[PDB]
């Protein structure tokens, strides 16, 4: 009588909601597809691969559309040997964790707070004036309550024996820039900071690419363990073909265009950290000096073949493509105060902007955005179009967490800020939202960041800057631009 | 204490507030008031929002 | 050969899936929107904001919708001092770890099955008896296989110095109750135990609001490090239109009513946990004691700019939102068998239900919904409609953890339960079921608690239970209701 | 100026994205739906349940729809005594920490590379030379750099007290086989290791099964404190019905046809691990051993009750469902070499493989499918079709990694590989590609094994092949088929 009723208790506004209804959960529909295979195939490239250098591959055309795209990256298991046994010892120089570069810049802003005999004082005594002295520094700069002085006497345990490892997800950090390219014209560029930053906001709970590109969330143990033998990496390529089914790049309609990625790699000496200064780095199967030589790198693509009525309609009139297109602004820190001009273009869904410190990319911890002692390194930040106020004065959690709440898939781990005008900025096929840099004068990002950053021995500190902006690829007589 | 700061630094008390505040005297032009501390005084004085 | 008579082995079946198809993955389509921008502008309140106090805002209006809004909470470090050496000592009581109610109340519990001279014993002596007795109790109460008396003793490693601290998820907590009031009537209520509910069950992977909250995991040395500085919280509000851009609010659909956030503050005696009994707590920067006026609070609203050609539409014919409104049964509880009687109106989409120790409570642990020693306060719930089983007895878990599974992002970590009537409770533009209780005679929610639940230290402890319901607000002439 | 300007700044390009745009984000618009309401509804079997044994239930017809499916498994605690102490100390063996078999295996492929003394040398010394023989035989058969012994001495602190306990994922193990049937005919199968498998690729951040199937993520000391008392296990039977409120299975529409459950149970002794072999396994509440008729389950079912209108709408045309069916290929491996021929058949949406070493089966390890010293079992794999190499030779890491990153809600914790036909195999609606395997002559997955699997103890480790695959289910005159 009750679960009757209730089907019969309708009125006016339940028409809205369910006159004329047009879909039941009691039977399912479902819509019939066209017929298409997908195909995974790996590509050398055409080039050298090498550490420090440029290496390009032209893309093989092996279906009719190209959807996924990995970097697979072949690094050599690392074994170490003192310098004083080896029979050439000349290699280039690696961070070194008995010269801890950031500790040591670190200290240099706790030494003015330093009471009594530092020079003379005995390694445990310097430890704990060292801990005190960060106790005055932060009372006095931020009004913190002082923190128990072993509290901050964190040991990590470091292992007692010789090693070398790859430093944090180096499938990102070897990988300077990348430019996807159609008949010589840069469609995309993508860069080393830019895919950690997209990983932090976009990365899925469950589907982090940890494994895939040696990332071990700042774990030293587990990136020892993993350097001590062959690893094997599928970075990810996130162009626009790579987000939707419906973006996937239409090989058959640029028939007249090479395709071609362009990777320049980094430097070896920014891609290992050893235990100590006076230690060789070798190949662990090779038993030679670690050489530039030893990366290998190759191009896996995902094809998809389609059906022939379905091949012969696109190659008629494969039409436009809506993308989302890339751009850096990328300055040097000195001050406190910076103000970053972006000369960004086009539409603009998002931007990402985040720090590094000098001493954190000398210690070869190249995705530590964090400030002086681990530290958030922004105070406020304040968004300018036209010297008029966009976005007024906020505070560094706001462009960390609430726009990463609002618009993005997770909440970045590091210092990692963002801002979007995009209600959906991860939705590759709907716009929601864009300004229109290529119509104002000026956009400025002025941020005030902590006390001393960009000063000593953190002068020339990185910002970065990143935005998304949509442009339209267009398809014609088996060209693309 | 305004005049042991040489007037660099002004300290008032509200009586109808019963509150100590202080500002930005004499060097309210070449500097910028970064902390405060001292003894028992200090603390008795601005500790408690100026009570 | 395989490829292509793959896209010819087509039958009559093939037909319904691909006949006609109206879609291809090969081509992408996108579809245009109206212009629109987004503005984040924080406003301060228009009461004062103090701890224990009601204070209220109204919503300016700097745009033609609103969208998202937090509550931006500031909140002092913490410091304390002996009382014996603090000039004024008199300051509201905290719960302080050296008075462990909620040990002491589970203590209790296990008293009638101590042997031996418990009153005489060393305190060593006395925690053997107490994990022996917890054997006794739980192998009497639960048939329950006796744990090695190691393995019961968990020693906390509490840190050996003076410290006070927010309690767990402060930001949900200081929010007692919130009000959003259009026009002198109140739309919608949420409180800090729904929000925290809501945040268990609704809150996704990688987008925890633990930061944002000041929500530790139950870390104790956690929320000691965050509470020695001053605390930055953005507490998002989930009214019906921030979960939807299509739900945003039309300011300019509703000119002639004003905009009011209504919250009703947690106590300061209720927020702060201390190491002992005997220490002041003091504002950290300002070295005096803590103090209700110490309560900062803004609220950050997102406003929408449309373009003028909507906005005039949105003006003229607003119509009419789908909202979700929530509903509260409080109850004390004092027995081990009780009913709840849920007078609750309109058609309801789902229910939570959750308990309380008094202990827990009494503890400052205001978010642990745990029973005696930590277990399930619940044994079993019904659910009857007219006193007819709409729900026959099911066990706990069934409730928490399968209700959870079918209907809700996320499984809660406390002893939250769940019922839904709808298929997608968290799709707040698609109705997917609801039961009307405005047409019921009587809903009753009939629980088994834990033995000894709501007895003794424990007598009243708290019931909640939490509606989400259907509603229809209407937008007319520059009126909302 | 600015935001107005952005709105007239439009161009021929803007007039494909909005020009009469269907969608506003300032209004939402809703759908109505007809009247449902949802009950759970927990039923016995219709035969005894025991260990080892199959028992099955006929479903009842208490709704018009049939939606979620839980096998409700009632465990009971357990408890030990010493075989010396027990009345009747003759019971099933069970697998025992004394003698880990999993340990041994491993042990003996390292025993060529042992240097000294084995036999005669003290514990401590001969943990030491199986460490030291480890690095030589992973430097010699992988290239390895050599681990520091004191790191591959990891002492997992198991408790100096006796215990037994469920092994892992104890709900998904006790599951050998279920079939749903209907009329009789088996509509679709599924297994314990691919319910397993589906839960590592498809389980959701957040809504991960682990309590309501008894999974610790390999934590013996959470299984030990679980296995204590009475343990209850929600289990979800992840039918093609479940997967989506129109696919629920049209009860009204199957009048003539019996829908069965029918649930092959794994034996006891599989189910239980113990801290050492001379101990008794018994009940934790009733004080006798351990027996097969101590295995209780129910099933819980949730019912839709339609409206009249839709409920007769529904029996005279309840049309087809598209279905998803599972397919197995179960094989002995006693190579590195070997290859599996897949005699699947249909449209093939996607399928997965694992091997399981026969040394950790021994060992009642049944979900962990790594290889010896718990590395990845498999190197590489192909796919072949007809001879010709659909995939090509690719490392265990694409199959693992990419195929999960690209097709699935979550990659596997566990060596689980994948690899997807279909663009969005968890889309259980929307067929998104597929191989048919009905018209291939020969289906083919060559697998290269590590070194030494499936050599001497372990001779007759397992491969896992399971397929899913599309098939249509007809309702017609009250019968399915």
């Not at chain 1, 960041?449 to 500190?461: K, T």
Request: hydrophobic fraction near 40%; glycine fraction near 4%; aromatic fraction near 10%.
């Amino acid at each position: 009588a009750g679960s009757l009723t209730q089907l019969l208790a309708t009125g006016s506004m339940d028409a809205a909601l369910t006159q004329n209804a047009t879909r039941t959960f009691w039977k399912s529909s479902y819509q019939k597809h066209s017929l298409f295979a997908l195909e995974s195939i790996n590509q050398p490239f055409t080039t050298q691969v090498q550490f420090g250098a440029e290496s390009h591959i032209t893309v093989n055309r092996q279906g009719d559309l190209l959807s996924w795209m990995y970097l697979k990256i072949v690094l050599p298991g690392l074994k170490v040997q003192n310098q004083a046994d080896t029979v050439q010892p000349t290699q280039q120089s690696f961070a070194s964790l008995d010269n801890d570069v950031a500790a040591q810049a670190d200290v240099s802003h706790v030494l003015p707070y330093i009471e009594g005999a530092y020079t003379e004082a005995s390694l445990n005594t310097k430890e704990q004036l060292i801990a005190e002295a960060k106790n005055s520094y932060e009372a006095a700069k931020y009004n913190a309550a002082p923190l128990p002085v072993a509290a901050q006497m964190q040991s990590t345990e470091m292992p007692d024996f010789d090693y070398a490892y790859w430093t944090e997800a180096i499938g990102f950090h070897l990988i300077k820039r990348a430019e996807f390219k159609v008949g010589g014209a840069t469609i995309d560029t993508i860069w080393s900071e830019l895919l950690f930053a997209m990983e932090e906001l976009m990365g899925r709970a469950g589907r982090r690419l940890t494994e895939t590109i040696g990332r071990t969330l700042r774990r030293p143990t587990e990136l020892m363990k993993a350097s001590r033998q062959e690893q094997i990496l599928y970075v990810p390529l996130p162009w626009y073909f790579t987000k939707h089914p419906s973006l996937a790049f239409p090989l058959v309609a640029a028939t007249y265009h090479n395709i071609q990625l362009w990777v320049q790699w980094a430097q070896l000496n920014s891609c290992i950290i050893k235990s100590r200064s006076n230690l060789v780095v070798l190949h662990a199967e090779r038993n030679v000096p670690i050489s530039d030589d030893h990366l290998r790198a190759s191009l896996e693509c995902t094809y998809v073949h389609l059906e022939a009525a379905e091949r012969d309609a696109l190659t008629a009139n494969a039409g436009t493509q809506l993308i989302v297109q890339h751009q850096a602004h990328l300055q040097q820190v000195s001050s406190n105060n910076v103000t970053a001009r972006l000369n960004f273009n086009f539409p603009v869904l998002e931007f990402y902007y985040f720090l590094r410190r000098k001493a954190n990319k000398d210690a070869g911890d190249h995705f530590n955005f964090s400030g002086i002692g681990g530290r958030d390194p922004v105070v406020s930040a304040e968004l300018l179009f036209n010297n008029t106020a966009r976005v007024t004065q906020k505070p560094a959690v706001w462009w960390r967490a609430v726009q990463a709440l609002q618009f993005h898939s997770s909440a970045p781990l590091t210092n990692i800020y963002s801002y979007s005008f995009s209600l959906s900025p991860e939705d590759p096929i709907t716009p929601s939202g864009s300004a229109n840099f290529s119509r104002l004068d000026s956009v400025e990002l002025a941020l005030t960041l902590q006390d001393d950053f960009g000063a000593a021995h953190d002068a020339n500190s990185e910002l970065f800057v990143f935005a998304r902006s949509y442009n339209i690829l267009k398809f014609t007589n088996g060209l693309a631009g | 204490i305004t005049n042991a700061m040489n007037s660099a630094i002004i300290f008032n008390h509200d009586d109808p507030a019963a509150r100590t505040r202080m500002y930005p005297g004499t060097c309210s032009n070449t500097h910028v008031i970064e902390s405060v501390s001292g003894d028992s005084l200090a603390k008795a004085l601005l500790g408690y929002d100026g009570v």
